[PDB]
């Protein structure tokens, strides 16, 4: 059917610069293993096409879908050697199968080196040398390692990075200005990637409704003075935005997100007085500001929630005749009254309210049956608090490195079939929850911890879905979204797993470790700890500290200030004996 060219429409809407960045992230996320040169080629072809179509919408290919265009550019690049498999695989398909094929190949942990950070002088020099190649490489490296990174926010990070560089690269000492600041930016962007990967998994694995309910809760806490209608409209629009982003339709995602920020800012009077801060800012800063805005204050003088949800004669009628409208109003009313609760807790409270209606509205006297419903939330609210206190005390007491080691041991004993790199990455990230949340006062501490654990446990679920080995992980991952944390927390040691019979011997890498920073060295020690627990799951915590001690020792030894060939292979069978000494 006759239409306005989609590529020209999106090119026109977002401008060349964001179009180029969004297209580079598109390619880098679909073909994570192809070199930068290849992607650069592709992005230039797409950008020449878009400019051709903007000039004359009738030009060849201008009427095609964005999927057709990305697909044909990909398939027609002979360069794509197929030394990288599956390029032909998906190119065999017609649309829409082709695009689905490219999409099903996104790898949540592609086989790549940690993103090595050059020294500050080099970094500053490359930036000065050529900004476009510098930021091209940056978007490519971050997108291909995080193939569901929320695309407009990745653009925003690139701008933030550029500001840090501009400020630090003139300084007397570049490194010391730069390093804390790149570090803080990296942590915020990792949290962003983890938050977005949970939105995408909620949509993909549990359906649009799972994310709509999550967004309803969060937005009702952020904008509690807004009416239900406006909140619902925002949720609707944000749902479309994240579905498009999570499915690789990034130009549409970015366009639609900008339109949503424009909308919210034009209606800021009836949403939040806090929006004024954001609404004066330029495009990416404006949306980023809105994305994480602090909660507005609760409106004074709202009725008791039991009026509408317990005492109304029509509770059953509304639940039966308009369930999503009634339960969504419940989530809105209850959430706007409780900014201090975690989203996941509010969703679990919504689920328990629903289950009580399902049961009670089927009886002879439903009010009698659900009268105590809102009271019956207290035990769900209170449930975490003792184990949270004890885990924050553990953290307070142990410090980061030992808290991570405690959790590594705990989670390896729970789900010991999980791959060692996954258990290490997961436990380290659980340890960051300690660090980020325990230092808040308790009223802030319980909501911080609950929602961060949901983002880390989702990382576990998605990594396990790639290499699936543990029935228990499958079960907790697939049974729910909102009970994942109680589900994992409830697991004791798996007394059923068969210990690994290990001569862990020659699991030493020719002293490779020494170009590695203290950080990676810690990861290595933590990897050995996981391996110790899988070999001896009934070992004492003290035995583990010790057999790890003998690891640290043998590390420094062959890795000293002198050069010798193969010190490790005489010492592998003999650490094997020293670990047979402490562990049996
Ligand atoms: O599954 C998610 C689960 C955790 O929550 C279960 C239930 C309690 O909440 C589902 C429902 C309330 O979501 C409404 C949304 C889909 O529509 C917005 C609005 C009402 O439509 C107008
Ligand atoms: O670990 C538990 O079972 C208690 C609990 C409940 C809710 C949220 C978090 C936690 N624990 C917890 C805390 Cl409080 C901080 C860092 C890492 C972990 Cl696993
Ligand atoms: O694991 C715990 O519950 C804390 C605890 C208490 C006493 C001794 C060791 C540990 N944890 C622990 C472990 Cl299990 C391995 C390496 C390093 C440390 Cl601090
Ligand atoms: Na797509």
Author numbering: 1 to 584
Publication text:
In the LSA-DIC complex, the carboxyl group of diclofenac creates the same interaction with Ser489 as present in OSA-DIC. The helix 540–550 in LSA is shifted in the C-direction almost by one turn in comparison to CSA and OSA, and tilted from Val548 towards two other helices of the IIIB domain. A second halogen bond is present between the Cl4 chlorine atom and oxygen OD1 of Asn541 side chain. Additionally, the hydrogen interaction between DIC2 carboxyl group and amide nitrogen ND2 of Asn541 strongly anchors the ligand molecule inside this pocket. The DIC3 molecule is present in this binding site in OSA-DIC and CSA-DIC complexes, but in LSA-DIC, this pocket is ligand-free, probably due to several sequence differences including amino acids taking part in ligand binding, as well as some side chains changing the shape and surface charge of the pocket. The flexible loop forming FA1 is the place of additional amino acid insertion in the LSA sequence that causes a loop dislocation, and together with an alteration of several amino acids, changes the architecture of the binding site.
Serum albumin (SA) is the most significant transport protein of vertebrates; it constitutes up to 60% of all plasma proteins. The whole structure is maintained by 17 disulfide bridges, which ensure durability of the overall protein fold and simultaneously allow its flexibility.
